Design an enzyme around this catalytic site. Structure first.
Site, PDB file in Angstrom:
ATOM      1  N   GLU A  11     -41.295  20.662 -29.501  1.00 36.76           N
ATOM      2  CA  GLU A  11     -40.081  20.732 -30.307  1.00 36.76           C
ATOM      3  C   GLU A  11     -40.283  20.326 -31.761  1.00 36.76           C
ATOM      4  O   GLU A  11     -39.531  20.755 -32.628  1.00 36.76           O
ATOM      5  CB  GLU A  11     -38.961  19.885 -29.680  1.00 36.76           C
ATOM      6  CG  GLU A  11     -38.483  20.360 -28.302  1.00 36.76           C
ATOM      7  CD  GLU A  11     -37.801  21.732 -28.323  1.00 36.76           C
ATOM      8  OE1 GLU A  11     -37.574  22.296 -29.415  1.00 36.76           O
ATOM      9  OE2 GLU A  11     -37.483  22.246 -27.233  1.00 36.76           O
ATOM     10  N   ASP A  20     -33.340  26.535 -34.923  1.00 39.69           N
ATOM     11  CA  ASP A  20     -34.363  26.650 -33.885  1.00 39.69           C
ATOM     12  C   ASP A  20     -34.894  28.090 -33.776  1.00 39.69           C
ATOM     13  O   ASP A  20     -34.612  28.936 -34.637  1.00 39.69           O
ATOM     14  CB  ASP A  20     -33.856  26.108 -32.533  1.00 39.69           C
ATOM     15  CG  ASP A  20     -32.712  26.933 -31.933  1.00 39.69           C
ATOM     16  OD1 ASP A  20     -32.439  28.066 -32.385  1.00 39.69           O
ATOM     17  OD2 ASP A  20     -32.080  26.436 -30.976  1.00 39.69           O
TER      18      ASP A  20
END
Ligand SMILES: CNc1ccccc1
Length: 162
Positions: A11, A20
């Site tokens: 991440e 994202d």
């Protein structure tokens, strides 16, 4: 290596609001703020999560706090899901981290549609499960991350994260 270190690798860490892989406003260690295309809506979600007016910027401590909560919420969600719980419980600790990783990325619901993979994982047909897992939007959109998670499922080792 553990679930926290694993997800930190997959991440990243960013202290300002970013989008994202799907284009959704996110902060810290993969903490999804909203699926809304409104930046003001995302800033609102951030302030709500942190408990102060952040103006789109948080500290490392704050990011790690949300990360803690997110990991914890992912696990607790798995255990409250009738389809995911038995497969999770059947797994060893290393493959359980791969399970948490998936739920963290795509949500509970997204994973529950891996019915055929879930069955192969519970039967411990590791190579088969690994083949079935890659036949997915998930793999095609995020192949490098998916390869690592799938390798973890296939081997029950941390080889893909060393
Ligand atoms: C296949 N990923 C997964 C996620 C949650 C519980 C079991 C397995």
């Amino acid at each position: 290596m553990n679930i926290f270190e694993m997800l930190r690798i997959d991440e990243g860490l960013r202290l300002k609001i970013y989008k994202d892989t799907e284009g959704y406003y996110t902060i810290g260690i993969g903490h999804l703020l909203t699926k809304s295309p409104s930046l003001n809506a995302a800033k609102s979600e951030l302030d709500k999560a942190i408990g102060r007016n952040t103006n789109g910027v948080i500290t490392k401590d704050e990011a790690e706090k949300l990360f803690n909560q997110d990991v914890d919420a992912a696990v607790r969600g798995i255990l409250r899901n009738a389809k995911l719980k038995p497969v999770y419980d059947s797994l060893d600790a290393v493959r359980r981290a791969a399970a948490i990783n998936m739920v963290f990325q795509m949500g509970e619901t997204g994973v529950a549609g891996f019915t055929n993979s879930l069955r192969m994982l519970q039967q411990k047909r590791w190579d088969e499960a690994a083949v079935n897992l890659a036949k997915s939007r998930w793999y095609n959109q995020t192949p490098n991350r998916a390869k690592r998670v799938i390798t973890t499922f296939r081997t029950g080792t941390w080889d893909a994260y060393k």
